[PDB]
Each structure stands twice: as C-alpha cells, then as structure tokens.
Symmetry: D2
Subunit: 215 residues, 4 copies
C-alpha cells in the first residue's frame, strides 16, 4: 500500500427495475483516509433518481487507521477483498450492493453491482430532494470469522429534515488476515461538483478509524 | 385477454453474495384457477451454491383465483402487462431484491427477472442449503400512492425442524391505469415438486386464491 | 375445563408516550366458536389522548375455533392458564409492548394486562385519533425453543383513506407442558361495535378461526 | 439552573417478560464535563432474572459535554426539565420500551422511569445473563416535527466473545420552547463500576461528549 493510489471502477445496476451503468476514475491517500474520483454515467442517463443513493457504494482501505486498531483492509492486499451491503431507507426503499476490489499496480479496481427497489415515486429519492449525506460513524465488529460494518445515517433534505438509512455491510478479505476488535470509522462523503443531470460527478470521502470515548 | 390456459417463458439474471448466475424457465397455468407450474434450468453459475428456495417466489399474481367481489388488478393489467419490485428480508439479515417485468405475447407471459441477494452468512440455512420448503402463506394487498402493494411475512421450514422467517414487500405497477382494489388477501402455496441433485432442473408449482378474510 | 360459554374479566394498566392510564373490562365468549365480546371502561387517565384501536388487540387465543386436525395450544393450557408477550411495531416508529397473564376462576378467564407504547409522533394517526378500524388479519403460529410464537402483519384503515401498518410479534407461554402444534394460521377480525364519544365505554368484538392455509382455506 | 456539580435521584418501575421489578438510585455528576455516576438498589423483584445491562442506558443527556458551537437542547430545558421515550430493539427480537420524566429540585435531578421488556428468549444472552458490557457508542441527534430525536445502533459484548446488537430510538421532549440544534452526535461510554453477586447493588458510570463528526 503506497501513499498515493489510483482507483478504477465500473458500476452496473438498476433502480426500480430501470438499468444504468457508471464508470469512474480517481485517486486517494489510504494512510490519510482521503480520496476523490470523477464519475461518468455511461448507460441509463439521465438518472431519474437521487445520485446520493450511489455515492457510498463508490473502499475502507481509504481510512486512517491508528496504530492501536488492526487494519483489516490494508492487510487484505495485494489479494484484495470484497464487500456486500444492504442499505434500507426508512420509507422502505432498499438498495443491495456488492464490490469486488482488486489491485493492479497502484490502482484499485472495483467491480460494482447496485440494485435498488421499492422507492416511492413521490419520495425524496425518485424526486431528487436529497442534499447530502451527513457525517457518519460506522460500527465494525467480527462475526463468524468475517468483518461486519453497521452505520445508520441520514440524508439531509431540500426543505430541511433528514431521510434515514441503515447500512449493513459484510467485508470479506481474499485471504485470511488478522481480525480487529470492535471499533469505529467516522465518515464524511461529499459531492463537490456535478453537472445539471449528474452525468459527471466529482466525489470525495474522508474517513478515520477510532475506538470511541475516552477520546 | 386472459385465456383459461396460458404459457410462461422467463429468464432470471442475478447474483447471491456477489456470485452471478442465470436461470431460464418455461411453464403453463390457469389464471382463473390460480394454479401454475414450470420447469426451470440453470444456465449460468451452476451448481448454485445457495438454497434454491430463495428463488422460487420470484419465479406473477395473475395466477391467482379472484372472486367477483374483489377487484383483480393483475388480470386487468393485460395485454399491456405490469411489473413488480420486491424486497425479501430474512430474519438473519440476508436480503434479496428482485424485479419482474411481465409482458404478454399471444398466450405466453414473458418475464424479465433480476435477483440480487446479499449478506447471507456462510453458516446460515441458505448458504448451507438446509431449507425444506416454503410454508403456505397469506399475502396482504393494499393501495398506496396510486399503486398496489403486497406484504407477506412467511417462513421456510428447516432440515432439523424449525422455521426461517422472511418478510416480503412487493410493489405492483400496472403499465396502464387500471381499477385499484380494496384491502384484501391472497393465500399462497408454492412447492418444488421435483429437482435433480444440484437443482440444475426444477419443477415448481404454485396455487393462489384471493379472499377478504373473516367476514364482518 | 373449557365450557361452551365462558366469561371474561380483565384490568389493563399502562401508558402511552409516558401518560399513564387504566382500563377494566368484563365480557363473554364461545371458545369453540372463536367468538367473544366485552365491555371496557376507562378507570384512570381519561380521556385517552390516543387512538383506542392500538389497545383492542391486547384486550386470548383460546377464543379461536381450532379444527380437530390442528393442535390447540391454548385450550390445553387450562385450568393452569398461560401468558403472552407482544411487541407491536407501527410503520411510523410507534412501538407498543404488551403482556397478559391469563388465569381461570371457575368459568371466567382473568387477564392481568400491561401496555406500554412509546415514540408515537404528535402528527401521527395514533395521537391524532385518525384510525378507523383494524382490517381482518391472518396470524402465523410456529414453535421456537419449545414455546408457541405468533406473527401477524396487519394494518389500520385511516380516516382519509389509506392504511397504517403494524407488525405483531407474540410469544405464547403455557404454564404447564402441553402438546405443541405444527406451523398453522389463525384468521382474525376484531371490531369496536359501540363506544361513547371519548371512548370511556367501548364494546369490543373478535372472531377468530384457525386453519392450515391452502389447499382449502 | 445548571451547576458544575449536580445530584441524581431516581426510581424505575418496570417488568421484563411480564415479571415486575423496581429499582431506586442516587448519584451525582458534572453536566459540563459529561460525566456521572450513581448507586442503584433493587427494591422489588430481586434477584433480577435478566441481564442488568439492558437497564443501564435507561438509568439523562444533560450529562453530556456540549461544545460552544452546538446548541444544547437539554441544558436549555431546565429548570422545567424534559422527558424522553425510547424503544430498544435487540437483534434477537427482545424489545424494551422506556420512559423517563426528568424534573429538577434544587441541585438534584429527579427521574420517574418506566421500563418494559418483552420477547426475550429463554436461551438468549439477556435471560441467560451472558452480557459483559455495552461497547462505547455514537448517538445521532436530529430534529423531526419540532422535537429532538436520538438514534444509536450499538451492541453488548458477550461471554464467549461476539456482540449482541441493539438499536435505540429515542424521542426527547423539552417541557418548554427551546432552541433546536442541528444534526449532531454524542459519543457515549457507559460502564458498571462495581456490583454485588445478584446485581442488587450496582455502581454505574457514564461519560458522554457531543461533537459534529469529521472533521474535529
């Protein structure tokens, strides 16, 4: 794992049965927990749903881990790891996502599948009334020899208020790696620039691991 | 539009825990008797490493006997057809999202199905294939925001006894505006009647009848 | 131990959003016909500031017609009786936890009921009293760790149309060892047949029949 | 209204799986440091047949260190006080509903607490008393319909390793009109400091600090 790495990805998926595809390129510093990328809609544009539901699917290797917390993700390379996630929104909209992450030289390669269902037509997702994800705190922990990650967060809405979502992620390293203890990863994901119909999106994330209070 | 004897043709593309597969099927049924059967063949991703039972309820409420006093949303929706979306949340956290776009070509219904399941534990009854069958169930149907919803929480019986629960949440969307029904129910019973060892071939049956529950 | 005509006496103590209340009731029913009725009167905490409908399904599966081919967990449990626990999760986050300890004195069932609901929003149908009635329902009963479980998703019809859903999760506990049944169903239909303006007095009815689903009905 | 050192007096009445109990406690804390401690005494229903840990987070966000840039909903609410309601939904189906009416008498906060837990399985970690402690947690507070909400998904560490998860959903209600805060967080760490064999006596501690997340 080098101080400066690259990212290459393609997402294929569907929302309420309507398919789309997105590709991206970016860069980041795994030891600083920061990353950025440019995403382009390749199929299914203009997307008829809020782009925000996709952003957290677009790699916990980009998280600053302190010395005293075992780093599952940086350990998993060069072989890599995969993850599966269900994102259950409070109005019944559900998104299932998978990412198979490999490494080629200094570039991480993502193979992503995304499938969302049951988003109501008048809801904030289909009507594109989301502003941004709030900062969040993920709760990791081991179960049956694999790493799990839970984070219940929310999207701020146009006229104020919040639209909640529960994340449940399973992380699976390619090879056996040292498993960590119960810890946290704080997140802050932001869309810094985009064109009108989100065909082009510049996305950033900042993430740091910690163990909660005393600090 | 609906004939007493119809045919079914389908293809499902999907993935379970990130591992892709594909299944095609042909079948037949009687929409007015609420009965149907089909033969399914795994075309890609075999041998399937998960319990086939998680697929079966994705493999058409037009095959449901509707009484006269209950509006039939599904038979009304043809020849144009309808689509549906469904989330299947299992009690151990495994979740399956599925969609079906149903069209009609002559006397044959055509299904375009996508199926995506995640977070099934390796030690669980799905990945370990220790499910026996779905129990009979009762779906609850109601209108919300101009479309028809269907909720049913049911369970799979397990090898050594016991049950593995799952909550279904389906949204039915007719392609044309049709008359919306009142709150009602649909009883179900789905069964795998035959299959080879690795479920490459599966003969699947379903019986369904609509009703209004216990009277006032 | 169970006669064709039995009587009912109960007292419920509870709270909704921290506001306590108490209700007592008397009634009668036919256990083998799955029918019952009762008169309930608010004794404390009136006038109730929440929709009465959230209480009704807490106000006894012994009042359900069981066919001969389905094992009756509840009629077996008497004269000793049984208890049950339930959580009712409404789709807007309102949660009600309830318990009922059911005893028998002669031909009268005695209920000791606790009811606690929290997180009902002020603008919701419960606090705004916008519920009409429970729809008919189909409960699912199955065994887990030697006790009988009962799950039912149902809904309340609302005053301007639409439905307000709720998930029931009930655990039934016989006081003595009884024969456990297989996976089966119980159809329900509960109705408020009469009530005064502030629901100080309520006449409540329930009809329930067990079955094994399709084929048949 | 809030001084650097305050006292705590409380009584909890409740039931778990239909079995009633009652607990009273006295304690003290520093609201501006986000720290508190208390001694609790089982008065009725002892010896408690369930894991004491399910009660501890019910035994006051006034004891949370709020930075200057984040509006303090709780310190504003006194001397009139505030109340809160909570449902705690454990991953095996055990559900606990709790309420606390918090008043102020001089320098002492007074809690009137009700606690009701249901559907805890006999073979589960609660009824088998296999919990070790709550992990540290991060609560998220946000406004909905003019009142303050608090959500936290956390877990209890267990006896042979592993974790037993629980989702908290809290509604905070000030008795008078106060300034509402923006979306923010409160980190928690609750610990039983000492206890006797059957938990009839328990010394409990909590440390809490509010923050706005990354970066900090």
């Amino acid at each position: 794992i080098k101080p400066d790495m690259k990212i290459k990805l393609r997402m294929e998926g569907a929302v309420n049965g309507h398919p789309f595809a997105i590709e991206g390129v970016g860069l980041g510093k795994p030891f600083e927990g920061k990353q950025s990328m440019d995403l382009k809609v390749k199929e299914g544009g203009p997307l008829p749903f809020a782009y925000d539901i996709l952003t957290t699917v677009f790699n916990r290797v980009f998280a600053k881990y302190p010395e005293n917390i075992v780093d599952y993700f940086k350990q998993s390379f060069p072989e890599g790891y995969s993850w599966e996630r269900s994102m259950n929104y409070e109005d019944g909209g559900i998104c299932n996502a998978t990412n198979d992450i490999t490494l080629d030289g200094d570039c991480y390669i993502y193979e992503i599948r995304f499938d969302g269902v049951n988003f109501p037509a008048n809801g904030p997702v289909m009507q594109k009334r989301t502003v941004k994800w709030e900062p969040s705190t993920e709760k990791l922990y081991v179960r049956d020899g694999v790493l799990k990650g839970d984070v219940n967060t929310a999207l701020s809405l146009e006229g104020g208020g919040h639209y909640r979502c529960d994340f449940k992620t399973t992380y699976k390293a390619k090879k056996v790696v040292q498993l960590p203890d119960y810890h946290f990863v704080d997140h802050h994901i932001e869309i810094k620039s985009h064109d009108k119909d989100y065909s082009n999106v510049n996305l950033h994330e900042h993430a740091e691991a910690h163990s909660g209070l005393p600090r």
